[PDB]
Amino acid sequence: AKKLSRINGREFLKQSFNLQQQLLASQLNLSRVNESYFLSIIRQYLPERYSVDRGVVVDSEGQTSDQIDAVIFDRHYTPTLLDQQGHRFIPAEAVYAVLEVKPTINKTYLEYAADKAASVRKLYRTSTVVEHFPIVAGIVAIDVEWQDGLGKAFTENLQAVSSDENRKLDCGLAVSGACFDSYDEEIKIRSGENALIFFLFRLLGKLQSLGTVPAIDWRVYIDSLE
Amino acid sequence: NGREFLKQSFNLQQQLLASQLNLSRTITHDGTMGEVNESYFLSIIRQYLPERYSVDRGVVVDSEGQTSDQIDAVIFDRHYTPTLLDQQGHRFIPAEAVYAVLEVKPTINKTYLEYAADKAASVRKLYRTSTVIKNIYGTAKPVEHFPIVAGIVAIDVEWQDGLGKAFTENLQAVSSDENRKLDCGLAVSGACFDSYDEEIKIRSGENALIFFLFRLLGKLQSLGTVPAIDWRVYIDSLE
Amino acid sequence: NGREFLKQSFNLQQQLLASQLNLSRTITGEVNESYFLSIIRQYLPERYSVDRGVVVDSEGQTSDQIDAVIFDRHYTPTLLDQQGHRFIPAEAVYAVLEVKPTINKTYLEYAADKAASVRKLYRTSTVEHFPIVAGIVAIDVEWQDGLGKAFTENLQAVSSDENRKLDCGLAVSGACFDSYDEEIKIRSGENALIFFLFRLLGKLQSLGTVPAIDWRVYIDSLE
Amino acid sequence: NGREFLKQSFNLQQQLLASQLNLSRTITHDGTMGEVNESYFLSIIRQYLPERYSVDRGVVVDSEGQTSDQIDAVIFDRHYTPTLLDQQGHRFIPAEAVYAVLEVKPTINKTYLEYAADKAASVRKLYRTSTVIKNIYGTAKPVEHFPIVAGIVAIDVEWQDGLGKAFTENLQAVSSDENRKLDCGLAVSGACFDSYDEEIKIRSGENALIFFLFRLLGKLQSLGTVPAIDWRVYIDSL
Amino acid sequence: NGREFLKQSFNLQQQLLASQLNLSRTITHDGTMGEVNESYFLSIIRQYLPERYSVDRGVVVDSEGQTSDQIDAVIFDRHYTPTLLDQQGHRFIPAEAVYAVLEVKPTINKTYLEYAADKAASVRKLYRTSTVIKNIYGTAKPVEHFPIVAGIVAIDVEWQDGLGKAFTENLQAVSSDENRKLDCGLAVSGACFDSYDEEIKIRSGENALIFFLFRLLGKLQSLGTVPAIDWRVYIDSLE
Amino acid sequence: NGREFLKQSFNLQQQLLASQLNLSRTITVNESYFLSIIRQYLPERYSVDRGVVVDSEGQTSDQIDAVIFDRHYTPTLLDQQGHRFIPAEAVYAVLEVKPTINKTYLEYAADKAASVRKLYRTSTVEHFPIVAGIVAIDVEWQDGLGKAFTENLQAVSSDENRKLDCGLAVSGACFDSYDEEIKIRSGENALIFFLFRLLGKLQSLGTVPAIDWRVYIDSLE
Helix, strand or coil, rough: CCCCCCHHHHHHHHHHHHHHEEEEEEEHHHHCCCCCCHHHHHHHHHCCCCCEEEEEEEEECCCEEEEEEEEEECCCCCCCCCCCCCEEEEEEHEEEEEEEEHHHHHHCHHHHHHHHHHHHHCCCCCCCCCCCCCCCEEECCCCEEECCCHHHCCCCHHHHHCCCCCCCCEEECCCCCCEEEEEEEEEEECCCHHHHHHHHHHHHHHHHHHCCCCCCCCCHHHCCCC | CCHHHHHHHHHHHHHHHHHHHHHCCEEEEEECEEECCCHHHHHHHHHCCCCEEEEEEEECCCCCCCEEEEEEEECCCCCCCCCCEEEECEEEHHHHHHHEEEEEEECCCCHHHHHHHHHHHHHCCCCCCCCCCCCCCCCCCCCCEEEEEEEEEEEEEEECCCCCCCHHHHHHCCCCCCCHCCCCCEEEEEEEEEEEEEEEEEEECHHHHHHHHHHHHHHHHHCCCCCCCHHHCCCCCCC | CCCHHHHHHHHHHHHHHHHHHHHHHHHCCCCHHHHHHHHHHHHCCCCCCCEEEEEEECCCCCCEEEEEECCCCCCCCCCECCCCEEEEEEEEEEEEEEEECCCCCHHHHHHHHHHHHHHHCCCCCCCCCCCCCCEEEEEEEECCCCCHHHHHHHHHHCCCCHHHHCCCCEEEEEEEEECCCCCEEECCCCCCHHHHHHHHHHHHHHHCCCCCCHHHHCCCCCC | CHHHHHHHHHHHHHHHHHHHHHHHHHCCCCCCCCCCCHHHHHHHHHHCCCCCCEEEEEEEEECCCCCCEEEEEEECCCCCCCCCCCCCCCCEHHHHHHEEEEEEEEECCCEEEEEEEHHHHHHCCCCCCCCCCCCCCCCCCCCCCCCCCEEEEEECCCCCCCCHHHHHHHCCCCCCCCCCCCCCCCCCCCCEEEEEECCCEEEECCCCCHHHHHHHHHHHHCCCCCCCCCCHHHHHCC | HHHHHHHHHHHHHHHHHHHHHHHHHHHHCCCCCCCCCCCHHHHHHHCCCCCCCCCEEEEEEEECCCCCCCCEEEEEEECCCCCCEEEEEEEEEEEEEEEEEEEEEEEEHEEEHHHHHHHHHHHHCCCCCCCCCCCCCCCCCCCCCCCCCEEEEEEEEEECCCCHHHHHHHHHHCCCCCCHCCCEEEEEEEEEHHHHHHHEEEEECCCCHHHHHHHHHHHHHHHHHCCCCCCCCCCCCCC | CCHHHHHHHHHHHHHHHHHHHHHHHHCCCCCHHHHHHHHHCCCCCCCEEEEEEEECCEEEEEEEEEEEECCCCCCCCEEEEEEEEEEHHHHHEEEEEEECCCCCHHHHHHHHHHHCCCCCCCCCHHHHHCCCCCCCEECCCCCCCCCCHHHHHHHHHHHHCCCCCCECCCCCEEEEEEEEEEEEECCCCCHHHHHHHHHHHHHHHHCCCCCHHHHHHCCCC
């Protein structure tokens, strides 16, 4: 029976996120993956101005992304195309970020997550009523396959994919205890029990910097219909 | 394909709504079609609309104590606006929170156009305050009220030629008073109309629902958010 | 007509709340804040959230437990909490309300202590703050005078420390007060709940939306 | 104390219900330009009843394709019964799942008693199957359907004597046909009745709602759960 | 492996609950400036229990008008039992609907065992009717009531030896009066007990929560469904 | 007519399901579309969700697209919607959602079913066979559910662990062996037939039997 010492607000904050980090790792290590676990947690965390769900992004020209594990998008200003939870059909102009859930962070899964991101970023976003911002993209996994962790070879893998802004992966989380992002230009990496709280707050900081998706004339979606 | 899936999503919903509205018709003693249940239309337009909009059946009220008639689908704000301790299916909605009002009726004909217009007038006649809360060092935003949107949703159109010349002449007659104007309408059999661009624009066929919803969304978007008002006008008269 | 239905829709809820809080007082622990939370949650614009919990700041300090925190969730992240036991960052808080058995000196001082425990918390400016509203909700008023001389002196007394100021209160038996217009304004009778709620909303409106701060101040000292 | 809190919990909801239904009756011009709004009544009876009972506006259907009239408040099963892919506010309900039907109307008088009895008949005339899966003779008791309960909820009572002599004469007349029987009613002004014990039992005053609801529950409980039947009768004709 | 995921699912929830109750302890100065917040325990036991069981904070009432003390977590029926028009967080529960009551306290010690026992007794002393409704043929099935289960939930155990000799003597002393018997308890730091097998069985360590929950499930299961009784006994005294 | 409304409601949902599953195929299918409909249809005594089945000996199934299971008498192992962790004794049926009904995906769905049926179900306090099926957009054979199909299905059903009792193609086909003989329907009523026949089969199983859940904790220390 554990002797529990007295807690304060900072330790409760840390435990509230790290215990959920452990839960997610247990859940993902089993499903070897089911993104539902991650969706629950990031949905619970994000400000209500953000919605997050699995689905497909569409544009007003009728092109679609691949299937995306976690799309972070607007519903406050944006119509719903008569979809339901777990299977969204999301206008491209509503999208803030896309995250792909995979078993591990290696070169194969980073390329696959970048493929997914490019299928969303290539879609057409109207400016009929605007300053569109780049969609944030990332990868979520249990662990990192490299001995190095998120080390030499990992950083080298982003650099070679640096050229194509559509394949860019802005951020990532290994719930075993590592995260990265490039929100500050330089790639910043963290390790350990706070990886989840770091990933989530850094992502919220990046989303915040982008502001609300610009308001657009949704009737571009019906212009070619009869 | 993305465009076909968009078309199909809405058209299959259009067909579902037509079937449900028909299933819901009251049984008459005179062999006519009967009145319809609005609730499935509400669930669809609620699902569709951006979350800044709320929509429900209810009565609109103003700070002088006047009420509208019952409205099948009031589109209104809840992000900035209090609730008057009402319930799903019977909202009691302050007039300053109202964007639009829609009546769900059996058919588009002269009777139900006039009826929907009478409902619309009973909301548009309500008083909307321009009082705002003290703004101490802030730049004052003068409250500019927009006209409330009103419309009709029905199963079909009684005119054999649909939304044709006789329909349009009736709509104009009805809408020759601004309080009674019907901005828009939908027959889920396959027709919709609106005067959002001044000229009456009419569509027919499988895309009537998707056109009606996206056109309404664009009109709502042009209205902006209801202007902030001092809600205490609602308590100023009370003992 | 509409004014009478307006009055009834609130007054019957005032009576329902007085009935439940009256029961809770005879049974008692502390009086159960649940009915009050459900009513003020139903009333408030959706830009405001309201729940029981604890306020926390980026330096790790916490408030006392608060029966009803009115706070933002549209722009503010959730610290992985759940209904009935929120863990709310200080910069998201608009108001705090304590539900107590009665409005008297003891429970006014108690509510003021709870308010100070929230107002002492640090709110970052990293990217100007408004004063948090604080108040008391109770069944009745202990003085046979009501919200009279002894009440005014006691409110004036606690409200001399700005951390302890109680801006407002409600006795669901039929009394409310606030200092939103500087002068203490008192109302009595069947419309106390509707007055309390609309006046509180007007005060909240004047505060504006919580300012957008850089939430990463909450992780800056983690390793 | 506990009994006083019980009384107030129901009587204050009775007052809230009376307030809203009175408003709706006025705004619909006495149920002529619109239907009295049943939403507050639905929320209260849903909240009160055990979860084994569902309640909503809808239309009842049987396996032969016959449909009832629209009903303001159907009390029905969803624990053992499939849903026919509907949404809240307009249910498409198989007849074998129905416990009770209640009509919400402007007033209790001859006109609306006859109207409500006609609605009740449109439901009770539907066919309820006695077919069960694994129907081997001698292995189970045959299904025995119970009589569906029907009633009327209104703002007030129009007769000069309230729920007196003319009322009971009218009730007995519509109820001489088992299909048309009205078992119970509630006037939110403060009166209720039922024939659950054969004798017409009437209550008046502040406890009308609590009596109506507890007496209705007692009648429902005496019926038991809807009998389990073979839902494939609904597809056998297709 | 499925068994490790089972263990971790429950042990991580145990740590989460310990963490939340640890904070509540500190914030309330060990329950001296407010009660420990039961609602995180409620959410977990509500998630775990089969849907035949409802769980919430409230007061138990009987048909004679008597009430219990406030109870942190009543486990009760809603499938067959009416609601007395209450709300989440403050239920007003008929006594015939109650399976179990649990009190969340700062710690397991003599003071709080006695306090949890006094709460349990305030529920068990309430009158449960045996009146039963006749069916359409005039026949009612007699019923018999089971004893209500009661327990205590806390962050830790104050005694140096945990759930050892002093604890056992105190639990036996409290429980020698059946009204006050505490059948079970959980210290979320890592210990649980029950007397479901007519002898006190104690577990400690990382599996305390999963043991407590599954043992309580088994006890509830043995009770069966609450007996079906005539709810109109609640209205028999009213005019 | 009521039967026409009944038919129209289900067939329109069949068409919507076909359209939804077809979009996630062209892109690659997403089972959540199907889960929503079957959940809406089934009596509330049934729960349905994606997840993993587990037994008291710690073994697990493969991931299952749609498990039909009890939550009225059965505890929840502190899971959440979209990834359930379901005791084997709570399970009525499993269904795998795949692009098409053909040999390959019939074998894949049979494999999933075996991974659930192999699990140990305690009798501490007799067990019904778990129902297993496939849901798909269309049928590969030009024959439809033809002679090739029945030959392939009865090959898979030589092992009771791998039996596929039923299946649905939302293009307009369904089958089951609930009556021993394989019964096939085609056309616009495929969804309503599949769902009501499944409902009848579930009804025949009765409620999952009550068990002593202490077997899930017996080996923990």
